[PDB]
From a paper:
Here, by combining cryogenic electron microscopy, genetics and biochemistry, we identify Balon, a new hibernation factor in the cold-adapted bacterium Psychrobacter urativorans. We show that Balon is a distant homologue of the archaeo-eukaryotic translation factor aeRF1 and is found in 20% of representative bacteria. During cold shock or stationary phase, Balon occupies the ribosomal A site in both vacant and actively translating ribosomes in complex with EF-Tu, highlighting an unexpected role for EF-Tu in the cellular stress response. Unlike typical A-site substrates, Balon binds to ribosomes in an mRNA-independent manner, initiating a new mode of ribosome hibernation that can commence while ribosomes are still engaged in protein synthesis.
Our cryo-EM analysis revealed that the ribosomal A site was occupied by a previously uncharacterized protein. For the Balon-bound ribosomes, particle classification revealed that nearly two-thirds were also associated with the ribosome hibernation factor RaiA (state 1), whereas another third did not contain RaiA but were instead bound to mRNA and tRNA (state 2). By contrast, Balon lacks both the NIKS motif and the loop A and instead has a distinctive HP motif that directly binds to the decoding centre at residues A1492 in 16S rRNA helix h44, and A1913 in 23S rRNA helix H69 (E. coli rRNA numbering). This binding strategy allows Balon to stay 10 Å away from the mRNA channel, facilitating its unique ability to bind ribosomes independently of whether mRNA is present or not. In the absence of a P-site tRNA (state 1) the lasso loop is poorly ordered, but in the presence of a peptidyl-tRNA (state 2) it is stabilized by contact with the 3′-CCA end of the tRNA.
Numbering used by the authors:
A (entry chain Sn): 2 to 89
B (entry chain Cl): 2 to 273
C (entry chain Ba): 1 to 44
Amino acid sequence: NNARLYQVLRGPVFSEKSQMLGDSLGVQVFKIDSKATKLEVKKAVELMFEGVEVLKVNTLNVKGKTKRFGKNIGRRNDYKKAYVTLKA
Amino acid sequence: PIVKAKPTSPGRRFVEKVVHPHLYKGRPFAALLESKSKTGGRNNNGRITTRHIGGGHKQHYRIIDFKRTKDNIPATVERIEYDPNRTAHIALLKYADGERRYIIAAKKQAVGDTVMSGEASPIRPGNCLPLKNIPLGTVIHNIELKIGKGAQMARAAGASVQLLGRDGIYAILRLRSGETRRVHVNCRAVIGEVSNTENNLKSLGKAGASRWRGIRPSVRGVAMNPVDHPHGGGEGRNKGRHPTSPWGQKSKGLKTRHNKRTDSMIIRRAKK
Amino acid sequence: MKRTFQPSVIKRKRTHGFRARMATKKGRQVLARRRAKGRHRLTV
RNA sequence: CGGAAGAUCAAGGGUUCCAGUCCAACGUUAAUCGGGGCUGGGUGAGUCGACCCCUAAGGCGAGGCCGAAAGGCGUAGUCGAUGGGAAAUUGGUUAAUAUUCCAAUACUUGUUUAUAGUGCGAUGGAGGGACGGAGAAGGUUAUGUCAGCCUGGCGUUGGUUGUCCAGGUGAAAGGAUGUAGGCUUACAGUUUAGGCAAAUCCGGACUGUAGGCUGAGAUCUGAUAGCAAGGAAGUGGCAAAUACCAUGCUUCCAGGAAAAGCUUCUAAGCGCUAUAAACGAAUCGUACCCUAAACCGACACAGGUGAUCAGGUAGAGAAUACCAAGGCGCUUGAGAGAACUCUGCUGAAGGAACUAGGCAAAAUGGUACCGUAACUUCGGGAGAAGGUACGCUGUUGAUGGUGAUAGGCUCCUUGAGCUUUCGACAGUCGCAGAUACCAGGCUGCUGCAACUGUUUAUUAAAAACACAGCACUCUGCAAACACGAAAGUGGACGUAUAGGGUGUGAUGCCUGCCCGGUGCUGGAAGGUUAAUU
């Protein structure tokens, strides 16, 4: 369906690794839904960015960090990010 | 025969090994082999119910034809093999149709000769015949007890049975236990004594050789404490009581057979 | 020297875990008792 | 430090990893530093591992059996790795990931479409997979070392443009090839007491007809890769693994997983094999520690913690000494240089007088050769005891390997260069040549236990336990015996040359008398004797 692809991409990653990946290889880094497959990421990228072609999706799960705030020990959410390679 | 080892080690000084050059050096017939994991002498409760069992060499089970129901089809002895599951040698039989089996090998049974099963068979070693067709005084082995069940008696290496006579539907057999007993005359037996007659002449030599055969050490009751064994206890060496097992059952002379449904099969026992 | 606790995750989850508790009637009584005390850790 | 105190992991941990920032607490001191606080970042896979397919032990277990209940067992099955099952390597890149990204060159396995040919199909049959211990002879590579080549240097002090010095420099998987090794008759036909039915497949019985499979390494290709001072070199000799050939070969007895994938055969029933072309190969893990300050020990704790990699010079060596790469100086210092304590070094003369006792120390210690007693089970004792040589230099005899060079993935002869092992003779220096580290002390009498082993985790290692061997006794198989309430088990898919219990404990010579007591075995004439009636 075309309503599940709108939730696949949670937002871009802005960092030095992301910046230099974009500069050298033109590859976009997204924080993606925790349950998205590479095929779903490919379809979502190609639908939300009209005119681009996806060669490769590399995914990874990153565990959230523990950050004790005030009197409590809590942790951030895990998240999934995708490295997406686009046609030059 | 029996070959002494040279005393080149104290663990070799008393090794007397049973040697048979004539038995197969290769691997057994793969289709007659079954996997068999060791038990440690532990039952389905995981409890030790039989002491001094454990370790030893991995061995396959050779499927033995103890029944011999391929009657009237001759077999030729392909090879005589060592079997780790028994003290007797086994013979690979090759039947006329090409089916292969293992049987207990008789002493006077060589590679190449023909064995027969049934009632119209020659009285030669390795032939399986009902006890009514075997002449009296013939030395037999692999005795069936219930009709059609397969051989149960006289199977160990060197085992022979004297076929003394007959009374009705019973054959009178003298077993090597010194026991004369009845067996139904429709039960089968195999002609000749069992191979590997010098099994009992061997000497293991060292404790490790008993370990290789899966036998754990045995600790005398007098060396224990009284909480472990009726013989335990005492300042220094002492026995103190009538000899008995760890469960309190006397071990010098006390009879333990208790079976009334078979008591009528037994003619008598020998006194010595 | 070697100490008493030698951790192994599979062995922990197989002797003390949730499905090991739920396999026995006595393990389910362990769980009922932990829930009645209100423990935040039911099982290892 | 360097068979780690370096590197890669598994397990366990879980962000400790990297950067910035802070120094209260934490860190046994201070701290600007940190595995501490705070804020950000960081883990990229068809090929690595998991998942997945398969099974071991062992679980659970429609029905089934058993049991007051709870439950226990167990068939078919279904789970369960520590084992079997597809596949990639080099190099570059980040502060931090890399067989994952990037570059180059590969490999495995699918789906869809099409083109032809065409009997396909299994949870079943058969093959296969598929396996022990030890030992030995080879052949190799990894790797090392020298050389060559390239780039620099001419040395704070005699010499150093040379036969001088330093640094750098050797591309993999794969594709071909088919070597050293290893194994080995091949094909066709006829038929059938067998493989639960069927089978063209296996097995069996006959009849004719007479190199293959595997395999390290080398070589070619891959291959105009990458790599430094600011745009170079890149190939010869020798040595050489515990890695590979090799799941091999040879021997032995204690006789050596399973199942699937895979190859074939058919059954019920009604797609398959080649050629490509396109498209795919999901999900989870991946940071970091891991002989540790990140795990287990309450600690940043002298302990414990599986596997893997294994440079140089000496050396048998993974010992030891000193070094490489790499990594560290162990999170209080500074003085002083009393007693006393600890750990060492040397010690006149004496040499066990010490002491419960040579406890501790001292001593010995290597290789070759010579020589070696009582006794002995003929194996041993034995390295008994005790001697002698040993460095360096020159000359010189013999000798193993490898092979340039010529001559007739091969053979033979020849032997350059390099390297191995024994010697001889002559000289030479010192107190001393197995010079350091390293590395048996040895004898005589006698008790005990045959011996190797085992044991009181944490005060006892022994003469204690075990042991091969011996004897008694039980046990005829639904065995005796043991677990269990029973079912069900072990004994044992064993069968009296076996299995249990008991004592004794190699071996040599042997093992006397007593059956009154108490057991055990047999007997039953008589006496006594339960429930019941």
